[PDB]
Amino acid sequence: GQVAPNVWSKYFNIPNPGLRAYFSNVVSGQPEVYRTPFYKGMSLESICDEWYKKLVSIDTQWPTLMEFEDDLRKKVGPMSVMLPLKERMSDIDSYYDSISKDQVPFDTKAISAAKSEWKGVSRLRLRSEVNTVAVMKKSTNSGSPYFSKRKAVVSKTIPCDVYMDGRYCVMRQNGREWSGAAVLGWRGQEGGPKPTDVKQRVVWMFPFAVNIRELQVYQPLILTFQRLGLVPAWVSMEAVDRRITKMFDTKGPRDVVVCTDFSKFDQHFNPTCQSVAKELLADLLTGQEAVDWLERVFPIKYAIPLAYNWGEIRYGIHGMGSGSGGTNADETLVHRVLQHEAAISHHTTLNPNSQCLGDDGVLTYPGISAEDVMQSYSRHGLDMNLEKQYVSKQDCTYLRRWHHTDYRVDGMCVGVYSTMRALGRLAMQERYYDPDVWGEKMVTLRYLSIIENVKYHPLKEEFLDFCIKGDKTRLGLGIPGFLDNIAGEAQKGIENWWVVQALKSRR
C-alpha cells in the first residue's frame, strides 16, 4: 500500500504533525482500560452485582425485561482498548471482500412499494455548498487533505467538486486539486468484561469536501423525512415508541414481531444494494444538479481510497464507508425496501408501522417468520445469524430498547433502556480526558446523557439513587449552579431531560 512521500502529499497537506501522531497511534493501538471515577474503589462486577440485587425485583412481572437486561449485562466491560493496526487488517479487508458474496436483484415491486410511501412529498433539491456547510458540524475533523477542524479550513475547501476518476477520488477545492482518501478511524464498543472483548469498530473519516457534496442531498433529505415522520428514529425516541405502539395495535393477532440483526451490514452493502439506494434517491430528487450528483458524488462512499497508515493507501470498491454523510440514509432507504420485499415475497403487505434505521429493524406482516425474513434479506449478499434474530408476539427490542405491549405509559409502548448497559457505560469510558485540563463538569454531563436513557425503566428512581451514591459530585447536585444552568454548561434539550428533573426534585 505504500506511496512515495510526494504522492502522500497530494492526499494530505504536508507537513502535518497532528496527522503524523494520528497514524502512530493507529499503528500502536491503545491498550489501557479507562475507568471513570464512578464508584471509585469498586470493580465493575461489584457495581453491577449490587444493582442486580434490586433489578431482579422486576423478574416476576417483566421476565422478558430481565432477559433483555441479562443479555446486555454480558456485554458490560471496557470500551477503550484499541488494537494495533496489525490486528485490525481483517476488519479493513471485510469492507473490500464482503461485497462480492452471491447477490440477487431486488424485487421491482418492493422498490415501488418503498417509493409509494413518499408519494406527494416535495421532491428534494440540492442545497448549496455554502448553506450546507453553514449547518454542518464544524468541530469535526476535516479529514483529507488538511486533517484539521472543519471550521479552520472552510475557506480553503469550498467551492469544491469531487468525483471518482478510475480508482482515484479527485477533489477540486477552491483552486487546488487534491487526491481524496478516507482516513482509518476507530471506535470502541463494549463486548464483554475483558480488555480483549472490546469491539473494534472501523470508522471511515471522510474528506470535508466529499462530506459537503454528499450532504447537499442528505441534509435536505433527512430534514424532509423528519418533518414527515417517515423514519421515526431520525426524529426522537418518542416518535419511535409511538410507531412501536401502532405496530402492536395493528399486527396480526396470530403473528410475531421480528427484530432483525445484520452481521457487518456496512461491509456487505454491495453494488446491488447501492443501485437500489441510487434508484430511490433518483425518485426523491429533481433537477439537473441532482442528475450530476447521482453520477459523480453518490458512488464515492462505496469507492473512496482508504489511508490506513502514514504513506499507505488502499484502493478499489468496497461496502459502505462507515462515516459517509449518507451512511445512515442509503442504508435506511434500502432496508425499508428489504422489509417490503419480505412481505411481498410471501404474498402480503408490510405493516407500515414496521421500522428500520441503518442495520436495525423491527417488522411484522401476515405469516412472518424470522427464517423467512432472513432468507429474503440474505439472498442480496447480506449476512445474518439466525440465532441473533429475535421473535415475540408481545415484546420487541429495537435500538437497544425493550418494548412490551403491556408496558405502556400514557398509552405508549415506551422504550426501556438497560440499566445494566447504563452502569457499564457510567463505569467505563472510550477515551481518556485529563480532568486537570478538562474539568469534572464534562464527566457529569456524560453521566447524565447515559442515565437519561433509562427514563422509562420501571426502576429508574432506584437506579438514579444508586447512581447518585457512586458520584462524588452526586450527578451535579454537588456542583453549585450546575443543574440550574445546565443548558449553558452543556454549551460551554438537556434542560428538559427527565434525569435533570429527577435530580432537581431531590434538592
Numbering used by the authors: 1 to 492, 520 to 534
What does the paper say about this structure?
To determine the exact biological function of the insertion loop structure, a hPBV RdRP lacking the loop structure (i.e. ΔLOOP) was synthesized and expressed. Gel filtration chromatography showed that ΔLOOP was eluted at a similar position as the WT protein. The ΔLOOP RdRP was crystallized and its structure solved by molecular replacement using the WT RdRP structure as the phasing model. The overall structure of ΔLOOP appears to be essentially the same as the WT RdRP (root-mean-square deviation in distance = 0.4 Å for 3275 common atoms), except for the deleted insertion loop which became unstructured in the ΔLOOP RdRP. Given this structural information, we are confident that the removal of the insertion loop should not affect the overall folding of the polymerase, and that the ΔLOOP RdRP should provide an excellent tool to study the function of the insertion loop structure using in vitro assays. However, while the WT RdRP utilizes a de novo initiation mechanism for RNA synthesis, the ΔLOOP could only initiate RNA replication through back-priming, suggesting that the insertion loop serves as a platform for initiation. Due to the heat denaturation, the dsRNA products generated by the WT RdRP were converted to ssRNA, while the dsRNA products of the ΔLOOP RdRP retained the same mobility as the original dsRNA. This result indicates that back-priming was taking place during dsRNA synthesis by the ΔLOOP RdRP, thus producing a product that was covalently linked to the ssRNA template. Additionally, it was noted that the removal of the insertion loop significantly increased the TNTase activity of the RdRP. Given our TNTase activity data and the fact that the insertion loop is located near the C-terminus of the hPBV RdRP, we propose that the removal of the insertion loop structure leaves the dsRNA exit channel of the protein permanently open, thus allowing the 3’-end of the RNA molecules to reach the active site for nucleotidyl addition in an orientation that is compatible for nucleotide addition.
